[PDB]
Amino acid sequence: SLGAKPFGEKKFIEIKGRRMAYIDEGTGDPILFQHGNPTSSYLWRNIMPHCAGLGRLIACDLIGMGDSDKLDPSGPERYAYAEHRDYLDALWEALDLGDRVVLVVHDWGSALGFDWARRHRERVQGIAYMEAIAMPIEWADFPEQDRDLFQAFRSQAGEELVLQDNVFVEQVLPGLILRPLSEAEMAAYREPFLAAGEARRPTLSWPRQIPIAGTPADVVAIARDYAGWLSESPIPKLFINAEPGALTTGRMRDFCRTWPNQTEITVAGAFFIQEDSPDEIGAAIAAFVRRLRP
Ligand SMILES: [K+]
């Protein structure tokens, strides 16, 4: 069902000197749900109940996001992919996940999770993904009506748009969900970013990390490495496809459709599809996990 209540209360672990927040419920092998930009563990609140009793249900808040600590001092060089990965790799190590891990990933959670899966492939039981950053892309892969905004985030204008106007929380997120979010849901998504200034830097650094036309070179190389690995890996995969979808003209989807040992389902939504079809997504993930854990 829908609803504004979080799935569980947050726990905290200290990572490299900062507190990271996460949800961890139940017993068994883990099902790891990883949000992206500009969301948090809250994104999964109506999906995780569908997996009750299938294992340990975990949803981490990326550093600087959700209820996780900010990285102070912050500025133009803070919250790159590589820094997020350092914090997330250490958090997932500290959670004692075992070697039968199911990943459920979305948006930048998929770039972090795909890379983690490549480096820890001997421990990964299955991968469910949606709105994946599956490979390096080009500006032509964005619908024409979206290009100006993402070019602006990656220009000097992005600082005013995000640090001052908070447009990723206030405009992009609700604009890429067909259902209008409630005031309570918007308050949950706004909370980590209430303060003008560097509190909002994670939501600007993320669009400045999308691997587009070869830039940034380090994320492009990371995505090339996990794209090649995923295209030949025998790990079970669940590709959740959205209709009508958003922010893509289809080339990445056609690449994902070449990946091995994969089941594809289609659900209704634009980009943050968890807010339009949580029951469809949750039921699909639960069926996938039940097949992996008979
Ligand atoms: K619910």
PDB file of C-alpha atoms and ligand atoms in Angstrom:
ATOM      1  CA  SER A   1       0.000   0.000   0.000  1.00  0.00           C
ATOM      2  CA  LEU A   2       0.970   3.671  -0.155  1.00  0.00           C
ATOM      3  CA  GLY A   3       1.612   5.772   2.947  1.00  0.00           C
ATOM      4  CA  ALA A   4       3.984   8.354   4.405  1.00  0.00           C
ATOM      5  CA  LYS A   5       5.212   6.412   7.396  1.00  0.00           C
ATOM      6  CA  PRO A   6       8.788   5.093   7.239  1.00  0.00           C
ATOM      7  CA  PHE A   7       9.346   1.358   7.198  1.00  0.00           C
ATOM      8  CA  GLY A   8      11.353   1.300  10.415  1.00  0.00           C
ATOM      9  CA  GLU A   9      13.158   3.562  12.828  1.00  0.00           C
ATOM     10  CA  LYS A  10      16.772   4.406  12.041  1.00  0.00           C
ATOM     11  CA  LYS A  11      19.846   2.833  13.546  1.00  0.00           C
ATOM     12  CA  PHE A  12      23.277   4.431  13.357  1.00  0.00           C
ATOM     13  CA  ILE A  13      26.829   3.173  12.861  1.00  0.00           C
ATOM     14  CA  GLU A  14      29.958   5.314  12.997  1.00  0.00           C
ATOM     15  CA  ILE A  15      31.849   5.203   9.697  1.00  0.00           C
ATOM     16  CA  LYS A  16      35.183   6.978   9.150  1.00  0.00           C
ATOM     17  CA  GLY A  17      34.283   9.341  11.990  1.00  0.00           C
ATOM     18  CA  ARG A  18      30.723  10.135  10.842  1.00  0.00           C
ATOM     19  CA  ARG A  19      27.355   8.650  11.789  1.00  0.00           C
ATOM     20  CA  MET A  20      25.532   6.801   9.012  1.00  0.00           C
ATOM     21  CA  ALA A  21      21.827   5.990   9.314  1.00  0.00           C
ATOM     22  CA  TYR A  22      20.132   2.857   8.074  1.00  0.00           C
ATOM     23  CA  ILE A  23      17.096   0.621   8.385  1.00  0.00           C
ATOM     24  CA  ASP A  24      17.763  -3.021   9.293  1.00  0.00           C
ATOM     25  CA  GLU A  25      14.805  -5.319   9.980  1.00  0.00           C
ATOM     26  CA  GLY A  26      14.422  -9.070  10.260  1.00  0.00           C
ATOM     27  CA  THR A  27      16.714 -12.075  10.146  1.00  0.00           C
ATOM     28  CA  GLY A  28      18.411 -14.062   7.400  1.00  0.00           C
ATOM     29  CA  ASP A  29      20.446 -13.321   4.323  1.00  0.00           C
ATOM     30  CA  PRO A  30      20.150  -9.645   3.389  1.00  0.00           C
ATOM     31  CA  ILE A  31      18.062  -7.805   0.824  1.00  0.00           C
ATOM     32  CA  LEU A  32      19.850  -4.463   0.410  1.00  0.00           C
ATOM     33  CA  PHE A  33      17.770  -1.553  -0.945  1.00  0.00           C
ATOM     34  CA  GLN A  34      19.867   1.426  -2.113  1.00  0.00           C
ATOM     35  CA  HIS A  35      18.371   4.819  -2.996  1.00  0.00           C
ATOM     36  CA  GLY A  36      19.982   7.466  -5.208  1.00  0.00           C
ATOM     37  CA  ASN A  37      19.616  11.203  -5.779  1.00  0.00           C
ATOM     38  CA  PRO A  38      17.816  13.126  -4.106  1.00  0.00           C
ATOM     39  CA  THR A  39      16.129  10.444  -2.024  1.00  0.00           C
ATOM     40  CA  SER A  40      17.000   8.286   1.013  1.00  0.00           C
ATOM     41  CA  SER A  41      16.009   4.958   2.559  1.00  0.00           C
ATOM     42  CA  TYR A  42      12.514   6.527   2.758  1.00  0.00           C
ATOM     43  CA  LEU A  43      12.127   5.757  -0.966  1.00  0.00           C
ATOM     44  CA  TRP A  44      11.668   2.067  -0.174  1.00  0.00           C
ATOM     45  CA  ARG A  45       9.227   2.398   2.745  1.00  0.00           C
ATOM     46  CA  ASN A  46       6.234   0.905   0.897  1.00  0.00           C
ATOM     47  CA  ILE A  47       8.247  -1.719  -0.997  1.00  0.00           C
ATOM     48  CA  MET A  48      10.182  -3.366   1.828  1.00  0.00           C
ATOM     49  CA  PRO A  49       7.027  -4.784   3.573  1.00  0.00           C
ATOM     50  CA  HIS A  50       6.417  -7.029   0.562  1.00  0.00           C
ATOM     51  CA  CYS A  51       9.692  -8.813   1.394  1.00  0.00           C
ATOM     52  CA  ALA A  52       8.902  -9.433   5.067  1.00  0.00           C
ATOM     53  CA  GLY A  53      10.062 -12.885   6.108  1.00  0.00           C
ATOM     54  CA  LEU A  54      12.311 -13.420   3.063  1.00  0.00           C
ATOM     55  CA  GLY A  55      15.445 -12.209   4.837  1.00  0.00           C
ATOM     56  CA  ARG A  56      17.164  -9.271   6.496  1.00  0.00           C
ATOM     57  CA  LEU A  57      15.735  -6.055   4.991  1.00  0.00           C
ATOM     58  CA  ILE A  58      18.282  -3.217   4.874  1.00  0.00           C
ATOM     59  CA  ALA A  59      18.093   0.332   3.503  1.00  0.00           C
ATOM     60  CA  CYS A  60      21.058   2.661   4.036  1.00  0.00           C
ATOM     61  CA  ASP A  61      21.126   6.458   3.846  1.00  0.00           C
ATOM     62  CA  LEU A  62      24.058   7.601   1.707  1.00  0.00           C
ATOM     63  CA  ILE A  63      26.504   9.985   3.387  1.00  0.00           C
ATOM     64  CA  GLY A  64      25.157  13.533   3.452  1.00  0.00           C
ATOM     65  CA  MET A  65      21.649  12.177   2.736  1.00  0.00           C
ATOM     66  CA  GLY A  66      18.660  11.007   4.751  1.00  0.00           C
ATOM     67  CA  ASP A  67      19.600  10.899   8.437  1.00  0.00           C
ATOM     68  CA  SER A  68      23.304  10.310   7.728  1.00  0.00           C
ATOM     69  CA  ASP A  69      25.839  12.938   8.775  1.00  0.00           C
ATOM     70  CA  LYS A  70      26.968  15.719   6.499  1.00  0.00           C
ATOM     71  CA  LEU A  71      30.628  15.884   5.472  1.00  0.00           C
ATOM     72  CA  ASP A  72      31.914  19.138   6.913  1.00  0.00           C
ATOM     73  CA  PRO A  73      33.464  21.223   5.539  1.00  0.00           C
ATOM     74  CA  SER A  74      31.661  20.797   2.234  1.00  0.00           C
ATOM     75  CA  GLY A  75      32.167  22.551  -1.073  1.00  0.00           C
ATOM     76  CA  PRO A  76      32.597  21.991  -4.807  1.00  0.00           C
ATOM     77  CA  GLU A  77      34.863  18.951  -4.353  1.00  0.00           C
ATOM     78  CA  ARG A  78      32.735  17.119  -1.781  1.00  0.00           C
ATOM     79  CA  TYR A  79      30.424  14.128  -2.300  1.00  0.00           C
ATOM     80  CA  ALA A  80      31.920  12.684  -5.480  1.00  0.00           C
ATOM     81  CA  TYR A  81      31.037   9.121  -6.412  1.00  0.00           C
ATOM     82  CA  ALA A  82      34.380   7.913  -5.065  1.00  0.00           C
ATOM     83  CA  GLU A  83      33.744   9.468  -1.653  1.00  0.00           C
ATOM     84  CA  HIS A  84      30.231   8.017  -1.435  1.00  0.00           C
ATOM     85  CA  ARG A  85      31.677   4.635  -2.329  1.00  0.00           C
ATOM     86  CA  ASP A  86      34.257   4.802   0.468  1.00  0.00           C
ATOM     87  CA  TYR A  87      31.502   5.446   3.012  1.00  0.00           C
ATOM     88  CA  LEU A  88      29.081   2.895   1.553  1.00  0.00           C
ATOM     89  CA  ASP A  89      31.715   0.134   1.192  1.00  0.00           C
ATOM     90  CA  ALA A  90      32.670   0.623   4.848  1.00  0.00           C
ATOM     91  CA  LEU A  91      29.043   0.658   6.011  1.00  0.00           C
ATOM     92  CA  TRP A  92      28.185  -2.524   4.115  1.00  0.00           C
ATOM     93  CA  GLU A  93      31.296  -4.192   5.544  1.00  0.00           C
ATOM     94  CA  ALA A  94      30.251  -3.160   9.064  1.00  0.00           C
ATOM     95  CA  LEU A  95      26.722  -4.582   8.575  1.00  0.00           C
ATOM     96  CA  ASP A  96      28.072  -8.176   8.355  1.00  0.00           C
ATOM     97  CA  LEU A  97      26.106  -9.079   5.241  1.00  0.00           C
ATOM     98  CA  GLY A  98      27.401 -12.580   4.533  1.00  0.00           C
ATOM     99  CA  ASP A  99      27.820 -14.104   1.084  1.00  0.00           C
ATOM    100  CA  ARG A 100      24.200 -14.456  -0.179  1.00  0.00           C
ATOM    101  CA  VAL A 101      23.379 -10.796  -0.748  1.00  0.00           C
ATOM    102  CA  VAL A 102      20.466  -9.615  -2.893  1.00  0.00           C
ATOM    103  CA  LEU A 103      20.862  -6.011  -4.072  1.00  0.00           C
ATOM    104  CA  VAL A 104      17.872  -3.814  -4.953  1.00  0.00           C
ATOM    105  CA  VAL A 105      19.198  -0.650  -6.559  1.00  0.00           C
ATOM    106  CA  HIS A 106      18.005   2.550  -8.213  1.00  0.00           C
ATOM    107  CA  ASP A 107      19.655   5.613  -9.788  1.00  0.00           C
ATOM    108  CA  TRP A 108      22.975   6.371  -8.087  1.00  0.00           C
ATOM    109  CA  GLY A 109      22.263   3.419  -5.798  1.00  0.00           C
ATOM    110  CA  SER A 110      22.713   1.294  -8.926  1.00  0.00           C
ATOM    111  CA  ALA A 111      26.084   2.827  -9.820  1.00  0.00           C
ATOM    112  CA  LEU A 112      27.263   2.235  -6.252  1.00  0.00           C
ATOM    113  CA  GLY A 113      25.644  -1.207  -6.068  1.00  0.00           C
ATOM    114  CA  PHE A 114      26.769  -2.464  -9.490  1.00  0.00           C
ATOM    115  CA  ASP A 115      30.359  -1.509  -8.719  1.00  0.00           C
ATOM    116  CA  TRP A 116      30.140  -3.091  -5.256  1.00  0.00           C
ATOM    117  CA  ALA A 117      28.694  -6.256  -6.803  1.00  0.00           C
ATOM    118  CA  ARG A 118      31.546  -6.434  -9.331  1.00  0.00           C
ATOM    119  CA  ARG A 119      34.143  -6.110  -6.580  1.00  0.00           C
ATOM    120  CA  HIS A 120      32.274  -8.524  -4.267  1.00  0.00           C
ATOM    121  CA  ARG A 121      30.782 -10.803  -6.922  1.00  0.00           C
ATOM    122  CA  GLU A 122      31.502 -13.975  -4.957  1.00  0.00           C
ATOM    123  CA  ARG A 123      28.961 -12.767  -2.336  1.00  0.00           C
ATOM    124  CA  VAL A 124      26.064 -11.629  -4.576  1.00  0.00           C
ATOM    125  CA  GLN A 125      23.006 -13.866  -4.932  1.00  0.00           C
ATOM    126  CA  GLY A 126      20.909 -11.616  -7.175  1.00  0.00           C
ATOM    127  CA  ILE A 127      20.520  -8.064  -8.437  1.00  0.00           C
ATOM    128  CA  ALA A 128      17.226  -6.206  -8.942  1.00  0.00           C
ATOM    129  CA  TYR A 129      17.545  -2.822 -10.581  1.00  0.00           C
ATOM    130  CA  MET A 130      15.511   0.104 -11.894  1.00  0.00           C
ATOM    131  CA  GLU A 131      16.530   3.503 -13.315  1.00  0.00           C
ATOM    132  CA  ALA A 132      19.999   2.024 -13.585  1.00  0.00           C
ATOM    133  CA  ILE A 133      23.140   3.880 -14.517  1.00  0.00           C
ATOM    134  CA  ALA A 134      24.099   0.882 -16.599  1.00  0.00           C
ATOM    135  CA  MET A 135      26.854   2.348 -18.816  1.00  0.00           C
ATOM    136  CA  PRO A 136      28.417   5.670 -19.833  1.00  0.00           C
ATOM    137  CA  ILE A 137      26.015   7.744 -21.914  1.00  0.00           C
ATOM    138  CA  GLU A 138      25.845  10.773 -24.222  1.00  0.00           C
ATOM    139  CA  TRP A 139      23.692  13.899 -24.188  1.00  0.00           C
ATOM    140  CA  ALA A 140      21.580  12.348 -26.953  1.00  0.00           C
ATOM    141  CA  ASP A 141      20.441   9.673 -24.480  1.00  0.00           C
ATOM    142  CA  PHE A 142      18.460  12.370 -22.594  1.00  0.00           C
ATOM    143  CA  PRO A 143      15.100  13.402 -24.067  1.00  0.00           C
ATOM    144  CA  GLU A 144      15.587  16.795 -25.695  1.00  0.00           C
ATOM    145  CA  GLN A 145      13.257  18.476 -23.209  1.00  0.00           C
ATOM    146  CA  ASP A 146      15.505  17.368 -20.303  1.00  0.00           C
ATOM    147  CA  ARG A 147      18.915  18.338 -21.671  1.00  0.00           C
ATOM    148  CA  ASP A 148      18.943  22.031 -20.722  1.00  0.00           C
ATOM    149  CA  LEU A 149      18.270  21.331 -17.041  1.00  0.00           C
ATOM    150  CA  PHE A 150      20.936  18.651 -16.684  1.00  0.00           C
ATOM    151  CA  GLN A 151      23.424  20.760 -18.619  1.00  0.00           C
ATOM    152  CA  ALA A 152      22.629  23.578 -16.158  1.00  0.00           C
ATOM    153  CA  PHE A 153      23.296  21.357 -13.124  1.00  0.00           C
ATOM    154  CA  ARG A 154      26.699  20.592 -14.660  1.00  0.00           C
ATOM    155  CA  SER A 155      27.387  24.313 -15.211  1.00  0.00           C
ATOM    156  CA  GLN A 156      27.969  27.215 -12.848  1.00  0.00           C
ATOM    157  CA  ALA A 157      24.194  27.763 -12.704  1.00  0.00           C
ATOM    158  CA  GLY A 158      23.790  24.530 -10.742  1.00  0.00           C
ATOM    159  CA  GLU A 159      24.941  26.141  -7.511  1.00  0.00           C
ATOM    160  CA  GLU A 160      22.088  28.658  -7.460  1.00  0.00           C
ATOM    161  CA  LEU A 161      19.586  26.031  -8.672  1.00  0.00           C
ATOM    162  CA  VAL A 162      20.506  23.545  -5.950  1.00  0.00           C
ATOM    163  CA  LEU A 163      22.261  25.264  -3.029  1.00  0.00           C
ATOM    164  CA  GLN A 164      19.802  28.179  -3.010  1.00  0.00           C
ATOM    165  CA  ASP A 165      16.635  27.017  -4.799  1.00  0.00           C
ATOM    166  CA  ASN A 166      16.809  23.322  -3.774  1.00  0.00           C
ATOM    167  CA  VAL A 167      15.359  22.395  -7.146  1.00  0.00           C
ATOM    168  CA  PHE A 168      16.219  18.700  -7.070  1.00  0.00           C
ATOM    169  CA  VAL A 169      14.044  18.202  -3.971  1.00  0.00           C
ATOM    170  CA  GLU A 170      11.379  20.793  -4.720  1.00  0.00           C
ATOM    171  CA  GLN A 171      10.970  20.336  -8.494  1.00  0.00           C
ATOM    172  CA  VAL A 172      12.823  17.365 -10.016  1.00  0.00           C
ATOM    173  CA  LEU A 173      11.690  14.743  -7.518  1.00  0.00           C
ATOM    174  CA  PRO A 174       7.931  15.504  -7.543  1.00  0.00           C
ATOM    175  CA  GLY A 175       8.148  16.333 -11.247  1.00  0.00           C
ATOM    176  CA  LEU A 176       9.274  12.777 -12.056  1.00  0.00           C
ATOM    177  CA  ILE A 177       6.451  11.073 -10.140  1.00  0.00           C
ATOM    178  CA  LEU A 178       2.985  10.968 -11.648  1.00  0.00           C
ATOM    179  CA  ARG A 179       1.211  10.838  -8.270  1.00  0.00           C
ATOM    180  CA  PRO A 180       1.440  14.207  -6.453  1.00  0.00           C
ATOM    181  CA  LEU A 181       3.401  13.616  -3.251  1.00  0.00           C
ATOM    182  CA  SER A 182       1.663  14.504   0.002  1.00  0.00           C
ATOM    183  CA  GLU A 183       2.897  17.232   2.315  1.00  0.00           C
ATOM    184  CA  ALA A 184       4.114  14.552   4.727  1.00  0.00           C
ATOM    185  CA  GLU A 185       6.050  12.737   1.990  1.00  0.00           C
ATOM    186  CA  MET A 186       7.583  16.006   0.759  1.00  0.00           C
ATOM    187  CA  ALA A 187       8.563  16.865   4.340  1.00  0.00           C
ATOM    188  CA  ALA A 188      10.411  13.550   4.648  1.00  0.00           C
ATOM    189  CA  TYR A 189      12.322  14.167   1.413  1.00  0.00           C
ATOM    190  CA  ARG A 190      13.038  17.814   2.302  1.00  0.00           C
ATOM    191  CA  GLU A 191      14.306  17.186   5.862  1.00  0.00           C
ATOM    192  CA  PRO A 192      17.990  16.404   5.022  1.00  0.00           C
ATOM    193  CA  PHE A 193      18.092  19.492   2.804  1.00  0.00           C
ATOM    194  CA  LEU A 194      16.152  22.117   4.778  1.00  0.00           C
ATOM    195  CA  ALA A 195      19.156  24.405   5.234  1.00  0.00           C
ATOM    196  CA  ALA A 196      20.261  26.531   2.293  1.00  0.00           C
ATOM    197  CA  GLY A 197      23.892  26.035   1.374  1.00  0.00           C
ATOM    198  CA  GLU A 198      26.146  22.987   1.491  1.00  0.00           C
ATOM    199  CA  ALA A 199      23.565  20.760   3.208  1.00  0.00           C
ATOM    200  CA  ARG A 200      22.196  20.433  -0.329  1.00  0.00           C
ATOM    201  CA  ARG A 201      25.563  19.712  -2.004  1.00  0.00           C
ATOM    202  CA  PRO A 202      24.909  15.932  -2.429  1.00  0.00           C
ATOM    203  CA  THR A 203      21.998  16.717  -4.744  1.00  0.00           C
ATOM    204  CA  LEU A 204      24.256  18.872  -6.954  1.00  0.00           C
ATOM    205  CA  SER A 205      27.354  16.664  -6.874  1.00  0.00           C
ATOM    206  CA  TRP A 206      25.339  13.698  -8.133  1.00  0.00           C
ATOM    207  CA  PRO A 207      24.264  15.161 -11.523  1.00  0.00           C
ATOM    208  CA  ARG A 208      27.878  16.358 -11.852  1.00  0.00           C
ATOM    209  CA  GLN A 209      28.946  12.717 -11.651  1.00  0.00           C
ATOM    210  CA  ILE A 210      26.729  11.229 -14.385  1.00  0.00           C
ATOM    211  CA  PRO A 211      29.090   9.655 -16.945  1.00  0.00           C
ATOM    212  CA  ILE A 212      28.216  11.761 -20.019  1.00  0.00           C
ATOM    213  CA  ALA A 213      30.409  12.192 -23.118  1.00  0.00           C
ATOM    214  CA  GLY A 214      33.457  10.916 -21.255  1.00  0.00           C
ATOM    215  CA  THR A 215      33.200  13.226 -18.210  1.00  0.00           C
ATOM    216  CA  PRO A 216      33.963  12.680 -15.348  1.00  0.00           C
ATOM    217  CA  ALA A 217      36.644  10.258 -16.528  1.00  0.00           C
ATOM    218  CA  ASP A 218      36.784   8.295 -13.263  1.00  0.00           C
ATOM    219  CA  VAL A 219      33.037   7.505 -13.133  1.00  0.00           C
ATOM    220  CA  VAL A 220      33.063   6.722 -16.870  1.00  0.00           C
ATOM    221  CA  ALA A 221      35.780   4.118 -16.290  1.00  0.00           C
ATOM    222  CA  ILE A 222      33.981   2.666 -13.257  1.00  0.00           C
ATOM    223  CA  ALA A 223      30.726   2.364 -15.215  1.00  0.00           C
ATOM    224  CA  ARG A 224      32.501   0.837 -18.219  1.00  0.00           C
ATOM    225  CA  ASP A 225      33.989  -1.785 -15.905  1.00  0.00           C
ATOM    226  CA  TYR A 226      30.714  -2.849 -14.300  1.00  0.00           C
ATOM    227  CA  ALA A 227      28.811  -2.590 -17.603  1.00  0.00           C
ATOM    228  CA  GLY A 228      31.182  -5.084 -19.204  1.00  0.00           C
ATOM    229  CA  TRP A 229      31.078  -7.357 -16.152  1.00  0.00           C
ATOM    230  CA  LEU A 230      27.260  -7.262 -15.889  1.00  0.00           C
ATOM    231  CA  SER A 231      26.897  -8.047 -19.598  1.00  0.00           C
ATOM    232  CA  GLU A 232      28.668 -11.403 -19.073  1.00  0.00           C
ATOM    233  CA  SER A 233      27.845 -12.223 -15.452  1.00  0.00           C
ATOM    234  CA  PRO A 234      25.657 -15.276 -14.667  1.00  0.00           C
ATOM    235  CA  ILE A 235      24.236 -13.695 -11.486  1.00  0.00           C
ATOM    236  CA  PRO A 236      20.394 -13.697 -11.507  1.00  0.00           C
ATOM    237  CA  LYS A 237      19.018 -10.283 -12.427  1.00  0.00           C
ATOM    238  CA  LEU A 238      15.607  -8.589 -12.198  1.00  0.00           C
ATOM    239  CA  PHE A 239      15.229  -5.595 -14.533  1.00  0.00           C
ATOM    240  CA  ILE A 240      12.276  -3.426 -13.475  1.00  0.00           C
ATOM    241  CA  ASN A 241      11.245  -1.342 -16.500  1.00  0.00           C
ATOM    242  CA  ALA A 242       8.942   1.661 -16.178  1.00  0.00           C
ATOM    243  CA  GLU A 243       6.212   2.924 -18.487  1.00  0.00           C
ATOM    244  CA  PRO A 244       6.064   5.678 -19.558  1.00  0.00           C
ATOM    245  CA  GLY A 245       9.459   6.085 -17.874  1.00  0.00           C
ATOM    246  CA  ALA A 246      11.524   9.258 -17.903  1.00  0.00           C
ATOM    247  CA  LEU A 247      14.930  10.833 -18.568  1.00  0.00           C
ATOM    248  CA  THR A 248      16.003   8.365 -21.284  1.00  0.00           C
ATOM    249  CA  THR A 249      15.417   7.667 -24.954  1.00  0.00           C
ATOM    250  CA  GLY A 250      16.030   3.930 -24.637  1.00  0.00           C
ATOM    251  CA  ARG A 251      19.616   3.035 -25.543  1.00  0.00           C
ATOM    252  CA  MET A 252      20.582   2.038 -22.014  1.00  0.00           C
ATOM    253  CA  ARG A 253      17.473  -0.151 -21.739  1.00  0.00           C
ATOM    254  CA  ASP A 254      18.420  -1.983 -24.917  1.00  0.00           C
ATOM    255  CA  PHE A 255      21.881  -2.577 -23.454  1.00  0.00           C
ATOM    256  CA  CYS A 256      20.390  -3.882 -20.183  1.00  0.00           C
ATOM    257  CA  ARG A 257      18.198  -6.213 -22.231  1.00  0.00           C
ATOM    258  CA  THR A 258      21.367  -8.019 -23.386  1.00  0.00           C
ATOM    259  CA  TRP A 259      22.398  -8.947 -19.841  1.00  0.00           C
ATOM    260  CA  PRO A 260      22.423 -12.658 -18.930  1.00  0.00           C
ATOM    261  CA  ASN A 261      20.159 -14.627 -16.632  1.00  0.00           C
ATOM    262  CA  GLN A 262      17.680 -11.772 -16.418  1.00  0.00           C
ATOM    263  CA  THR A 263      13.939 -11.440 -15.906  1.00  0.00           C
ATOM    264  CA  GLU A 264      12.243  -8.199 -16.982  1.00  0.00           C
ATOM    265  CA  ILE A 265       9.005  -6.789 -15.660  1.00  0.00           C
ATOM    266  CA  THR A 266       7.289  -3.533 -16.497  1.00  0.00           C
ATOM    267  CA  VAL A 267       5.612  -1.338 -13.873  1.00  0.00           C
ATOM    268  CA  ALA A 268       3.818   2.007 -14.103  1.00  0.00           C
ATOM    269  CA  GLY A 269       5.793   5.150 -13.379  1.00  0.00           C
ATOM    270  CA  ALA A 270       8.084   7.914 -14.565  1.00  0.00           C
ATOM    271  CA  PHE A 271      11.470   8.050 -12.796  1.00  0.00           C
ATOM    272  CA  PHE A 272      10.983   7.622  -9.026  1.00  0.00           C
ATOM    273  CA  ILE A 273       8.725   4.685  -9.742  1.00  0.00           C
ATOM    274  CA  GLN A 274       8.723   3.536  -6.097  1.00  0.00           C
ATOM    275  CA  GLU A 275       6.224   6.307  -5.421  1.00  0.00           C
ATOM    276  CA  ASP A 276       3.805   5.297  -8.201  1.00  0.00           C
ATOM    277  CA  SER A 277       3.966   1.477  -8.049  1.00  0.00           C
ATOM    278  CA  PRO A 278       5.386   0.276  -4.711  1.00  0.00           C
ATOM    279  CA  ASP A 279       3.162  -2.823  -4.603  1.00  0.00           C
ATOM    280  CA  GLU A 280       4.021  -3.918  -8.160  1.00  0.00           C
ATOM    281  CA  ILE A 281       7.712  -3.409  -7.456  1.00  0.00           C
ATOM    282  CA  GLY A 282       7.603  -5.065  -4.037  1.00  0.00           C
ATOM    283  CA  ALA A 283       5.708  -8.089  -5.342  1.00  0.00           C
ATOM    284  CA  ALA A 284       8.192  -8.490  -8.209  1.00  0.00           C
ATOM    285  CA  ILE A 285      11.185  -8.301  -5.873  1.00  0.00           C
ATOM    286  CA  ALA A 286       9.561 -10.759  -3.452  1.00  0.00           C
ATOM    287  CA  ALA A 287       8.875 -13.254  -6.255  1.00  0.00           C
ATOM    288  CA  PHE A 288      12.487 -12.915  -7.464  1.00  0.00           C
ATOM    289  CA  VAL A 289      13.841 -13.501  -3.949  1.00  0.00           C
ATOM    290  CA  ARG A 290      11.540 -16.493  -3.354  1.00  0.00           C
ATOM    291  CA  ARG A 291      12.962 -18.076  -6.512  1.00  0.00           C
ATOM    292  CA  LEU A 292      16.510 -17.512  -5.217  1.00  0.00           C
ATOM    293  CA  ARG A 293      15.628 -18.717  -1.687  1.00  0.00           C
ATOM    294  CA  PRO A 294      13.144 -21.586  -2.178  1.00  0.00           C
TER     295      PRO A 294
HETATM  296  K     K B   1       2.461   0.971   3.075  1.00  0.00           K
END
